Structure formats: structure tokens, C-alpha cells
Amino acid sequence: TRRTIFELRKARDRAHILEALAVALANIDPIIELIRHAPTPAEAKTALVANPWQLVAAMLEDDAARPEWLEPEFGVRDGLYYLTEQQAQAILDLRLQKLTGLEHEKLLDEYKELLDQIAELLRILGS
Amino acid sequence: TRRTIFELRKARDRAHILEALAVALANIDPIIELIRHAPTPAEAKTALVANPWQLGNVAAMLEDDAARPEWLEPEFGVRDGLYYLTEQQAQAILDLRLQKLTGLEHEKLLDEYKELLDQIAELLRILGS
Amino acid sequence: MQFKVYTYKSRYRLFVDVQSDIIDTPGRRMVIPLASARLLSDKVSRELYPVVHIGDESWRMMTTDMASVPVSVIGEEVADLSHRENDIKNAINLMFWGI
Amino acid sequence: MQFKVYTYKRERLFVDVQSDIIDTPGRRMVIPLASARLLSSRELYPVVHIGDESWRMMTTDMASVPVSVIGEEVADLSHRENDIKNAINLMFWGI
Numbered sequence A: 001t002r003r004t005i006f007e008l009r010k011a012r013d014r015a016h017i018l019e020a021l022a023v024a025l026a027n028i029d030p031i032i033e034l035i036r037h038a039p040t041p042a043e044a045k046t047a048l049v050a051n052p053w054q055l056v057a058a059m060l061e062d063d064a065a066r067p068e069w070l071e072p073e074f075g076v077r078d079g080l081y082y083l084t085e086q087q088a089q090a091i092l093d094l095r096l097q098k099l100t101g102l103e104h105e106k107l108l109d110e111y112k113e114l115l116d117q118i119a120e121l122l123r124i125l126g127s
Numbered sequence B: 001t002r003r004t005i006f007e008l009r010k011a012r013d014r015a016h017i018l019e020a021l022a023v024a025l026a027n028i029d030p031i032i033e034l035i036r037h038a039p040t041p042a043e044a045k046t047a048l049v050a051n052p053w054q055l056g057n058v059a060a061m062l063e064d065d066a067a068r069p070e071w072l073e074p075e076f077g078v079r080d081g082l083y084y085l086t087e088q089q090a091q092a093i094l095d096l097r098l099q100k101l102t103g104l105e106h107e108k109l110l111d112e113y114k115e116l117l118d119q120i121a122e123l124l125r126i127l128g129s
Numbered sequence C: 001m002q003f004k005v006y007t008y009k010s011r012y013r014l015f016v017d018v019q020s021d022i023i024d025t026p027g028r029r030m031v032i033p034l035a036s037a038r039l040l041s042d043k044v045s046r047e048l049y050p051v052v053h054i055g056d057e058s059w060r061m062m063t064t065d066m067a068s069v070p071v072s073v074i075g076e077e078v079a080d081l082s083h084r085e086n087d088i089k090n091a092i093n094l095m096f097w098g099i
Numbered sequence D: 001m002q003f004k005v006y007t008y009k010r011e012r013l014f015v016d017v018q019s020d021i022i023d024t025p026g027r028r029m030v031i032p033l034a035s036a037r038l039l040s041s042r043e044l045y046p047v048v049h050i051g052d053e054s055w056r057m058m059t060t061d062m063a064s065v066p067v068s069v070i071g072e073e074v075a076d077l078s079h080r081e082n083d084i085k086n087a088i089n090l091m092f093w094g095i
Helices: A002-026 A028-035 A041-050 A085-092 A101-126 B002-026 B028-035 B041-050 B087-094 B103-128 C082-096 D078-092
Strands: A080-082 B082-084 C004-006 C014-017 C030-036 C051-054 C057-061 D004-008 D014-016 D029-035 D047-049 D054-057 D070-076
Touching (some): A002 A028, A002 A080, B028 B041
Antiparallel strands (some): C004 C014, C014 C030, C030 C057, C051 C057, D004 D014, D014 D029, D029 D054
């Protein structure tokens, strides 16, 4: 039982970062514009958490992939996504190649797999 | 002195990759569009070396050249106001992290590039004397 | 945890956990040893070998000494250098990518 | 040289992964190769071929090596650059 709980914490956390990237790719044009206009990373990071983003919404289904530590001010809150400072960082660290087609899918895929595991880990939690 | 040539080759090689980035950032929108439409990195890489790019406001910075590697083939580099990337340089552009797109980050590239260009010159002056 | 500086419990006095917190190794951990700053000359690249203040002395990250550390050797958390994240990540990035 | 595999100068195998445009006076960053067979993320530990053989790039065991110990070039993995780089990125950036 100790293991299960861990895997859920390991899972939620991992998926948390992959969400932000799936949303980042869901609106790259505006993200790029925002970044190539920020004088510095630090500023681009602020701008990123500052304003919410349109969702990946269908896929994004289940309020369990979110970290038990995730503040209530973050995440999907009214059809809009609110990035954590840590997630914005992840988006800033992305390598252009990750924008290719096959690469975009590998993210969505892993994200969906995590959401699957997180699902069964809960059935297992409940049961 | 070998010592000198070793220094020259090292700076050339280094600057060679930094050029690619200066050119890549001189036309990001079309690069982005090229990449965001390639199915795979491999393909994006091919696309990148395939067609030449406008020497942006970096044109004048490049400009009697000696910052190019003694090993660089003639089908590469600046040839006719257009830049032809090597497979190696394309890779570096694909490995770029978004944050390197910010303003202050863009400048540090152009600045190190310019420094290497200065050292190269000084090094040739030594191979000169 | 990533960006936290621990102690061994040797050779080096301190080390920085530079491994993503979203990657389980288990028993292991990628780290970058901290060398007392004085031991190096102010000439050395603060790009590849970043400097950090920890406690009452300045330290140099021996990036080229990057190595995996067995959790069994990890002592106690003694500092947080998360505010130096991009510099640490450029050190790392610059090593395998040169930029 | 980056992405090339060598052996040491005394009697086993590794891939130089450090950038060729970054100079470390006498050292060099390396990821040793373990026999692939014995391993039951295949993304964090890429499998490479050398001769009629396959190995696991033991990414978590990365390390610096004095260029003085570096033996012959046994193979060149330059054609796996993306895989290899992704593996290294996955460890520090977790992506």
C-alpha cells in the first residue's frame, strides 16, 4: 500500500509537468510571441504564469492527476489553465525539435498513459 | 607555433556553431514554421540544410573571412548573401531551448560570436608575424 | 531533490543534486561537487563552472566532475540553490551541447 | 570526440558525450556501455549497436575521464545523437 501511494505521487507530479507542455503546445504562437518579447527568461517566466491559457481539454479529463500540494489557484480553473512557476520553467527549457509533429504526439501519449495509471492507482486506492 | 593554430582551429569551430544560431535567430518565424510542420526532427534537419537563409542584421556582423573552419567545405557558409547550414549547425538550432529566444539571451550569443571573431583575427595576425 | 546542496555521509565537502525530481533512479542521484572557490582562479569560466555562495564561503561547481552518488552516501540538506537554476542548467547544457 | 566509442589503454567500453566545442584541458565526459542483454525507460538508457553486439548506455553512471587513459576508437554513434542527447536531457530536465 505504501508503494501505491508513492506511484500516485510520482505519477501526479510527472503528469503535472507534462500538462503544462501539452497546453504550451496547444498555443505556441502566443507563447513564442510572449517569450521572444520578454527581455529575459525571468520576465518571460512571470508573463507565463501571469495570464491563463486556453486548453487538450477533452484529454485533460477526473480531478486526480493534480498534486496534493497543488495550490487551488493553479490548474484548470474555468476552462483556462493557470501555470505554476515550475511549469513555466519547463516550457522555457523546451527544445525546438520538440515542436516537430512526431515529437508533439510523444508528449500527448505519455501524458495520457500517466492519466491512465493515475486512474488505476486510485481504483486500487479506493478498493 | 602549433599552439597558435590549435587556438585558431578551436575558435573557428566554436564560432561556426554560434553563427548558425545568429542566423537561426535572424529568421526564427520561418524556422519555427519549418520545424512545427516537420513530422520528425530528422526531417526538420534536412529541411534546414536544404534551403539557404537570409543573413539578417547579422549580415554586416559576418563580414576577407577567416572565421570559417579550415575544414569547412565550399558548399557551406555564406555564399551569395545567403547562408548554407551544415547538418551539424542544423542540429544545434534544433537543440535550442525557448528561453534562448528572450532579448537578453539573444544578445549574449551575438556577443560571444563577436568576441570569437575578434580572437580569430588576433590569431591570424600572430600566424602573420 | 533538484538544486539542493547536501554533504557526504569524501574528497569534496559539498555536492549539488542536479537531477530532475521527475526521474527516479533509486539509490542513485546525479550530482555536481562543490569546490571551495579560492581553489580556482578568477579566470575560469563562470559559465561552465558556476559560483555560488553557501554559508560563509564561495564555492565553484566542478561541473566536469559531475557524477552519480549512491543515496547511502548522501548526508544532510544544507542549502538551496534553486535561484541559480538557469545558470546550473546552462553549465550542464553547455557541456553536452556547448551552448 | 562526441558520440564516438573508445576503450581504455589497459586490460572496457564507453561513448564520449561531451561537446566538441567545449574544451576541458585534459578531461572528457563519458557514459559507459553495459551489456544490453542483461537489462529487462529504454529512453533514459538507449541501446546502441557496435559490431554484431548491442549495449545499454548506462546514463546514470556518467563520468569524466582523463584523456590519457582513452584508447582506440571502436565505433561512432553520431547517428544516434538525438537519442543520446534526449537521454541526457531526460536526466537533468526530466523531459
